[PDB]
Amino acid sequence: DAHKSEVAHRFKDLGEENFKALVLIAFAQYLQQCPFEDHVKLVNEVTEFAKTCVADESAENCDKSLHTLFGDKLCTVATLRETYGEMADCCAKQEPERNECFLQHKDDNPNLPRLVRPEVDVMCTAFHDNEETFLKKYLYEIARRHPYFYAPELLFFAKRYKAAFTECCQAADKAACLLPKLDELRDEGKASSAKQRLKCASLQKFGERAFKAWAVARLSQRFPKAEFAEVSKLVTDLTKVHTECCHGDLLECADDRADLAKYICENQDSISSKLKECCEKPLLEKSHCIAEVENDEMPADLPSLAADFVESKDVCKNYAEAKDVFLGMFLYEYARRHPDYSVVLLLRLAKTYETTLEKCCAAADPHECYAKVFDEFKPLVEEPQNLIKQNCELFEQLGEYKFQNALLVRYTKKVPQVSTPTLVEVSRNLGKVGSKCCKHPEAKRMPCAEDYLSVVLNQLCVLHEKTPVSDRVTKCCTESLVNRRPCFSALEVDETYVPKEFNAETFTFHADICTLSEKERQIKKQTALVELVKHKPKATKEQLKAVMDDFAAFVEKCCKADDKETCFAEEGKKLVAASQAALG
């Protein structure tokens, strides 16, 4: 029906190197606790066998589906019963139940130590002696910690990491080049892991119609020179894709992804003209590239949306004829015109239209009833543009670090009850969001913000369901996609909070504060700022500036000083004592 040998088709399709790396990521995600060692033979054997099928597709065993091959290898591991336990009982089953059985014993978050990043001298020296082992061991370590991370995407990050190593490992200050590049693409790797978990939960926590409206909006921004009927074809295929990808089967998700890229690339002309570099790329990178394509230009003279949606007499019956399709046509016309909008803003608008149409298409004079609906959109539009305008001018006046401290005070007062490391991690993340996004002009600021906020805001919510501390954070995390952010933006100062018991040790500073990296230094300052607010919640902004002003003096005096360890302990007891009286 399909190819005679699946393994051969994919070996020639991918190439040996991509095949080897991808086979290893798959077994790494399924047998996370086995030594690096075991996987390298497993991949070698899988790769020896695949080559025999490239030579002869009618050779031994080459006609079994890759799924069969995959489980067959998993069950040859002899430690499977002792190390994986009930995961070995899946071998008692036959296909297709066996694969579906291995599928649900993938361990979302297993118990592995956090990888400690060795020094730049020792990384570069290791990358030289054995490039292969260095890069593949780290692929194994990351895949065993991220079992649901799409394998092709993990391979793309590994190739970027390799690029950093090949370039920065032959420089004068290797660390000056390597470290920012590993921080950038580790935060990127953490941000992409979060997008993947968010979308899958979004699928089911808000509904398919909410999801389907999301993708209608997004696809209309990306492809404005395309018909609503092409867009809604693509929305439907994409929902199939995401549904089997979130389910977890790598092969099933990758086939579905490739077929969609092949379709998109055949029907380029009716879709978008920004699409020729991705379609000349190999099968593996095709959908990767199409996923990240720039928005096509909007058709030049587009009419006002008020004809089809306000002034036409037929709106109320075209709507009631097929309510959702009409709302999706509203959504597509509004979106193709506004790639400067966040998707969720466009969903607020379509939902506001919708709420106005059920009210107004019951009236006698509906056109009279809804002639101010388009007026209604504009404060919805104004709200996020303005808190962006406001927060990017703050960032511009304070620089990243001082802006992050502004946010620390803001969110500690809003939600005092949160752990102080978490307050620091999130206010540090938001400041990086402002650094990334405020470098766009206004026309691209709102998509940027939603792109990064939605992962920060979801990582915050998965953390909260685990260790709950605030009902007002539970509220916002359980609301509709469209109300998630405006809920957070509406959190006010907890005026029911009781100040924290003052603890002396938490505001004393030893001699290490000088000998620390620029990062760690800031972290310990920010940790104390939080605990200062947690103890002085009704401190004013000016009082706080005095307390942090005198503190900053206190470090610069007892760090240029010939005796460090004793100016800190004495000029600090005075600071703690002066601060307690300045506040209160």
Ligand X SMILES: CCCCCCCCCCCCCCCC(=O)O
User: Taking CB under 5 A as the rule, does residue 450 contact Cl ion?
Assistant: no
Q: Which parts are annotated binding residues for Ca(2+)?
A: 6, 13, 244, 249, 252, 255, 259
Contact region for ligand 9IZ (CB under 6 A) — 93-101, 128-136, 285-293, 383-391? Answer: 285-293
Interaction between residue 199 and Cl ion (CB under 5 A): yes
- Does residue 441 come out as left (phi exceeding 0), alpha (psi in the -120 to 50 range) or beta? beta
Nearer to Cl ion by C-beta: 62 or 250? Answer: 250
- Does residue number 228 form part of the binding site for ligand 9IZ (CB under 6 A)? no
Regarding 482 and contact with Cl ion (CB under 5 A), the answer is no
- Binders of Cl ion among residues 372 to 411 (CB under 5 A) are 389
Of positions 73, 146, 288, 414, contacts ligand 9IZ by CB under 6 A:
288
Q: Residue 114, class by beta-carbon neighbours within 10 Å (0-12 exposed, 13-18 middle, 19+ buried)?
A: exposed
**For residues 420-439, which are near ligand X according to CB under 6 A?**
422, 426, 430, 433-434, 437-438
- Of 24, 432, 504, 419, residue with least CA distance to 190: 432
Q: Which two tokens stand for residue 327?
A: 């709302």
Numbered residues of the known binding site for (4Z,15Z)-bilirubin IXalpha: 240
CA–CA separation, 454 and 439 (whole Å): 19
What is the C-alpha separation between 141 and 137, in angstroms, rounded? 6
Closer to ligand 9IZ by CB, 410 or 432: give it. Answer: 432
Stretch of residues binding Fe ion (CB under 5 A), selected from 65-73, 329-337, 348-356, 477-485? 477-485
- Phi and psi, residue 497, nearest 5°: -75, 140
Distance (Å, rounded) from C-alpha 376 to C-alpha 356?
A: 10
Q: Which of residues 242-281 bind Cl ion (CB under 5 A)?
A: 250-251
**Distance separating alpha carbons of residues 22 and 139, to the nearest angstrom:** 10
Of 364, 329, 370, the C-alpha closest to 346 is: 329
- Let me know: does 546 contact 487? Beta carbons within 8 Å: no
Q: Does 348 bind Fe ion (CB under 5 A)?
A: no
Give dist(CA 281, CA 278) in Å, integer: 5
Per-position DSSP letters for 75-106, written without gaps between them:
TT-TTIIIIIGGGGGGGGS-TTHHHHHHHTTS
Shortest distance in whole angstroms from residue 270 CB to ligand 9IZ: 22
CB closer to ligand 9IZ, 289 vs 371: 289
Regarding 442 and contact with Cl ion (CB under 5 A), the answer is yes
Can you read off the two tokens belonging to residue 181? 């590049």
Pick from 1, 292, 492, 501: which binds ligand 9IZ (CB under 6 A)?
A: 292
* Residue numbering of the annotated binding site: 3, 6, 13, 67, 240, 244, 247, 249, 252, 255, 259
Q: Which stretch binds ligand 9IZ (CB under 6 A): 156-164, 246-254, 373-381, 482-490?
A: 156-164
Rounded CA-CA distance 524/227 in Å is: 54
Binding residue for Fe ion, selected from 454, 458, 459, 526, defined by CB under 5 A: 454
Q: Tokens 């509709």 identify what position?
A: 480
The CB-of-15 to ligand X minimum distance in angstroms stands at 11
Q: Does 545 bind ligand X (CB under 6 A)?
A: no
Nearer CB in complex with Cl ion: 199/475: 199
The answer to whether residue 357 forms part of the interface with Cl ion (CB under 5 A) is no
In angstroms, the Cα distances linking 33 to 27, 79, 349 are 11, 10, 48
